[PDB]
Amino acid sequence: PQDLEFTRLPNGLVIASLENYAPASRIGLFIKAGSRYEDSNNLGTSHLLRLASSLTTKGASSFKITRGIEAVGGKLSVTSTRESMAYTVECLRDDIEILMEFLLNVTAAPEFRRWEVAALQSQLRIDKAVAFQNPQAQVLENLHAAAYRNALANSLYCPDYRIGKVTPDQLHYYVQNHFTSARMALIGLGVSHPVLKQVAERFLNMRGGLGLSGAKAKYRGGEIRDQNGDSLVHAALVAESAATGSAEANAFSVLQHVLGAGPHVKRGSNATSSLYQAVAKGVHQPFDVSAFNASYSDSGLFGIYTISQAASAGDVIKSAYDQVKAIAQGNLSNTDVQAAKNKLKAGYLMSVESSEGFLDEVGSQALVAGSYMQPSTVLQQIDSVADADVINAAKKFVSGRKSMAASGNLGHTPFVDE
Amino acid sequence: PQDLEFTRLPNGLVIASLENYAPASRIGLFIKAGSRYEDSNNLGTSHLLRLASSLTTKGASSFKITRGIEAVGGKLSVTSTRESMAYTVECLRDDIEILMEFLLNVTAAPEFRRWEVAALQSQLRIDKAVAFQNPQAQVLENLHAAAYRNALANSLYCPDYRIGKVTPDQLHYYVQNHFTSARMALIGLGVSHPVLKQVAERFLNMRGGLGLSGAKAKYRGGEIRDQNGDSLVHAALVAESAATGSAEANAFSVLQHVLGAGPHVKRGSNATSSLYQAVAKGVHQPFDVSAFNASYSDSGLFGIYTISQAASAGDVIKSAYDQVKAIAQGNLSNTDVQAAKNKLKAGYLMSVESSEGFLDEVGSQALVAGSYMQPSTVLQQIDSVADADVINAAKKFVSGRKSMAASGNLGHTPFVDE
Amino acid sequence: MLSVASRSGPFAPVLSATSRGVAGALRPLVQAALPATSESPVLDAKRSFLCRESLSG
């Protein structure tokens, strides 16, 4: 009951609370900040901000933050993306009012002291090497660099020349221009509404405005190659599609599930994947193919993604590109669109089961649109997508200027003009 | 006197011995090898071959090569490029017959032992870091990677993932397929002719043929960007021009000296450089610009090269590109071609004064053409270049597909489509 | 409107205070372990193997 309450304050801050009667609680703070908003001089400042949550703030030292939260069994955690940051705290119900005053010190009055930032610079090299033991992590940072000239090409991790050089004055400047009132959303899941309101009137005192925005993202059709000694070739081939919150954006979501976008049966043959079955006709060696789809506030990337052996990376990308051509020239059955609308509606409802998946979704909607829509509204929009929109989305891909990124032994990978 | 003798043996080996009466001698061996001839599996084998000259061979150990050559004051040295390798020995006149039997053991019967190759793998990291303290070394390896798909994009230095992994079996395979009789030239400068002939019949016993043919170089118009923390921006912008040994190749050489290709007066302002004077109209900050020109057996790259401050790298490349446009539409005076023919003829004669510059030039002509031409023949061909060929070379640059490579703080460098 | 994690494959990386830092929204290209031999990454900076499955209460 009381499905969500929703308030927009006078300084553009969005508060949204739901009162369950669960013994555990969760509180989030969601900000418009992320790699997008850094220029060519301060690259990597957002990776250091992500690591500096339990340093000394103006209201609690670094000993009292670590000891005060571990005393009641709580957690503190930061998740960011290219377009947003999210601070999230959790404990049991009667403990929630003390882990809420710590969270407003980490994000609203931090002190960046020299010897603590200097001791923290070695953590950037540890975190980047942990993330890059997966080959998907650097192929996707390269792909955003090969697809944009600015503002979405910046990586989530700090560049190697720049480790050791991020200064305390640069961290003070990122927060003073991007952590403002009209870019933030405070979402609570086991809390009442008037107490979350009385928490939020403790950072009204300044940073009440709009903040340094991000330059529009210009499409560059590039190609970045990366020869190394990995066993398999990871390759991605995209084009520019559609921003989030548009009528064409839902059709690329439906086209993603027609082609095949992940598994449903453990150890399965992906029988309803048109991409996977087209590749596997001629290729008999171990591979994996998928449909990639990313969506941001003013642009998005749609394309394919292959993983294959190095002597077969040309056969796999060529087979997975003729199948998208078959859809754009009209070969599209009617039951394939209906079976794909189910996976897009069912996966949206399984994503909102948990307390973290629910609080994720309410935080994205408060930053992007400024409202909340029930999951019955979202389920109707998916069913209004016609067969004339799945075809006009595979036409925009086939005739658009491409981009590429690859890794591995690249002696048989095609070039983006070939 | 006896300006050069010149013999081509039955197995395609070119011997050329000139008899001066100087107390010192010099002997070279010039081979068609180099990065060009390595594929995607054995990258860096030619950098390791360059470092392995004083290891154990079948006729002299690694102690006797170092001690036998230092006993008489001699030298042993290897110089290579993307298209050739050159082994060169030198001593006084009466000592020349013992430093000549060492040279035929280093290059014609080496033994690649495991523990010596394994101890040598740390030298690859030392040599690459010594070369890369100059910013011009990596900007030019990047530029060949951004301009070709294969066979001329391979660097002269081994890639970082590959250090520690070059095996003794790969070194045995690079010499067995590329160090053959019909790709080699033996040039002597203080030796008689019939003794250099009797030296060369001591590797006829095998490797008497042609070797692994080289794949043709395919032009890719690419762009490689490299953000780092250097103070100045190094940038290069080229197009495909002409192979060496053609009528159009001499006209790009003349056009290089019209634009400005280096200094003549110590701390001079380059008054006869049309590139340098066009840039320096609006730019008042420290810079340097030049004309780049490279030439190989089946292709070549012509373009410009700038060094500038990071906030001025767009003004410098744009000014240095309008001036090449002014030449291709006809604005070309007659005395500017004649003043440029002098610098190309005078610099060719000053390059052949020393004993190493002379022996360099005779070795290149024996591999490329298979003959020797006097410097009076070369001086006539430069004077036969017309004003209708300097214009038809700046037209091929202006309308051709470009390539780029940059380094430094790249926040103001243009993209290759902009 | 909807999120990156719903219909899109960008990244999120996470840093904790008491749990192990992670980073992914698309990353796992599954259906690549039924075709054989994709081996778990060898660590020189150890990371979560079960991502706190211990202490379940």
Add this chain to the structure above:
Amino acid sequence: MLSVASRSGPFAPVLSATSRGVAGALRPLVQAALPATSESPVLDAKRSFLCRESLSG
């Protein structure tokens, strides 16, 4: 025909089993020292000791 040291450009590397390893067919971009504050990059290996002047004369 000609080499690549004529038509400067192509860089070249040199190795000595007796003297210092080098690179330079064309990499000095002369007149680039005119730019002020071109502080000389201290060679770590400190090679080209006065172009190996030691024992040269």
